[PDB]
Structure 1
Amino acid sequence: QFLRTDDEVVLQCSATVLKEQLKLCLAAEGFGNRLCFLEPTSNAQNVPPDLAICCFTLEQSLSVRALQEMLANGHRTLLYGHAILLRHAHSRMYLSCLTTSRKLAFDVGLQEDATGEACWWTMHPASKQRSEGEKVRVGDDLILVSVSSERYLHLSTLQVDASFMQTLWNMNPICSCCEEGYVTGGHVLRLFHGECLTISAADSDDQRRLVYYEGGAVCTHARSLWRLEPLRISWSGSHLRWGQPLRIRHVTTGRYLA
């Protein structure tokens, strides 16, 4: 119920841009573009979010001074004071405050290592209720602050970047861990026929939209893969259960089967 080590999580944030009540994922592919960008979530219906990328596994939650010591060299609950490492679910490159203007404040973006001050981020709650040492409640206000520059993680007008101005980031966990042999949501897997589900190879006249069963060849190939997306921004990582909504993003296409 409280945020913890190895909890898959995303920075939901919040905004009321124009009139739309625009909550959004913070994400980047990492590969091919290490700079982070918005993945809007207020329209979690007709135009579904790229959930695959926004996921950020937690790694360690050292105390401020403790973190400073680790530089000089267990599903722990988070506390409002520790800095936290933030692994990308995909590229696995850890989150950081990279130095680039876009106003005068550093752009968010990935590293390639646990090492370095950039990786880490203190969590200061804003609310008078919340304070240090409290087990970190799900969905409570929290303000990431890069240890590397001690800018707040700001949502600039839209693109994210660290800045001395605050932004009220919010963070709903995807799931804790997983029980082995059982399907969590947000997971990517093949659907065996008992042989497996598939699509056509690229540069088919179909625009690769035709759907097939197939055996051989593809069963090892990437096009055989299928990412399940249970239909919630928040606890999408919950163990899969039949009879709940879930669009099936195809992997290689990135398209939803429909």
Structure 2
Amino acid sequence: EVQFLRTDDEVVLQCSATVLKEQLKLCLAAEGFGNRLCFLEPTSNAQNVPPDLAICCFTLEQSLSVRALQEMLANTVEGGGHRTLLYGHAILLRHAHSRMYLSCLTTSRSMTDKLAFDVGLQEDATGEACWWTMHPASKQRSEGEKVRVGDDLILVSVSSERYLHLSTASGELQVDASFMQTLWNMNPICSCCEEGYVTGGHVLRLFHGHMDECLTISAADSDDQRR
């Protein structure tokens, strides 16, 4: 049957736009430790050369209502989870890798003479700018419905009061949240996994013999160039 987007499940944002009259496969990402500003990772050429999806993997930390979030804000002083997501709830994305939370930033770029607020990864979830709110793209759904997989979403910022946006310009496709309510698809990369079993994305060490062998490339400063 049709699955639903449960909390505490890994996920990846997704969008598409036309540059040569073709729906390019794109996804948001960010390096984290270094340039904190987010950047766009193309994936349309995945058949002929694969992308780097490790940084792209986001995680749903929790979700709640707007008024409950405001009460959490007022109650700044500090269970089972898996609450199903509904439209109008205040989502909270998180970078699975860097452990830095997605948020808006009080910056500007490209000199639009207008708010851009280039999105990035805040170092801590404290403060109200970190939180985001979902909304429905297609009219066939409405507020309060149980959000499913595949349907298009319209993420909105809480504090900035600005909508996520794929900004096409002269340069590379910027993802500043400035102008337009872009149809942001929401691909579940993974979900609750079984204990003690292998899945994609998990990094592992290959053993041989009984225990005392490991596949590896030679260390650096070597004549083989580590190949």
- TM-score for both structures, normalised by structure 2: 0.88
Contact 1:106-1:163 at 8 Å conserved across structures: yes
- 1:205: Cα distance to partner? 2.8
Per-residue CA deviations over 1:123-179 (Å, capped at 9, x if unaligned) read 101211111221111011101111120211101111101123211111110111211
Per-residue CA deviations over 1:221-244 (Å, capped at 9, x if unaligned) read xxxxxxxxxxxxxxxxxxxxxxxx
Distance 1:29 1:83 in 2: 25
Per-residue CA deviations over 1:160-215 (Å, capped at 9, x if unaligned) read 01123211111110111211110111211111113222111123232211xxxxxx
Contact 1:98-1:107 at 8 Å conserved across structures: yes
Per-residue CA deviations over 1:41-69 (Å, capped at 9, x if unaligned) read 11112231111010111011111111111
**Residue 75 of structure 1: SS of its match in structure 2?**
coil
Q: How many residues align?
A: 209
Using CA pairs below 8 Å that are at least 6 residues apart, which structure has the higher relative contact order? 2
Per-residue CA deviations over 1:68-111 (Å, capped at 9, x if unaligned) read 11112211111111111111011110100112211531001001
Distance 2:186 2:178 in 1: 19
Distance 2:181 2:143 in 1: 18
**Residue 161 of structure 1: SS of its match in structure 2?**
coil
Distance 2:179 2:21 in 1: 26
- 1:18: Cα distance to partner? 2.0
- 1:6: Cα distance to partner? 1.0
Contact 1:29-1:90 at 8 Å conserved across structures: no
Contact 1:144-1:153 at 8 Å conserved across structures: yes
**Residue 216 of structure 2: SS of its match in structure 1?**
strand
- TM-score for both structures, normalised by structure 1: 0.78
Larger deviation: 40-49 or 29-38? 40-49
- 1:19: Cα distance to partner? 2.6
Distance 1:80 1:150 in 2: 17
**Residue 28 of structure 2: SS of its match in structure 1?**
strand
- 1:20: Cα distance to partner? 3.3
Structure 1 spans left out of the alignment, 5+ residues: 210-258
**CA 1:205–1:100 in 2, change beyond 3 Å: closer, same or farther?**
farther
Question: Sequence identity of aligned pairs in percent?
Answer: 100
**Residue 193 of structure 1: SS of its match in structure 2?**
coil
Distance 2:139 2:47 in 1: 35
Distance 2:166 2:224 in 1: 41
**Residue 65 of structure 1: SS of its match in structure 2?**
helix
Contact 1:71-1:115 at 8 Å conserved across structures: no
**Residue 33 of structure 1: SS of its match in structure 2?**
coil
Aligned to 1:192, which of 179, 204, 207? 207
Structure 2 spans left out of the alignment, 5+ residues: 76-80
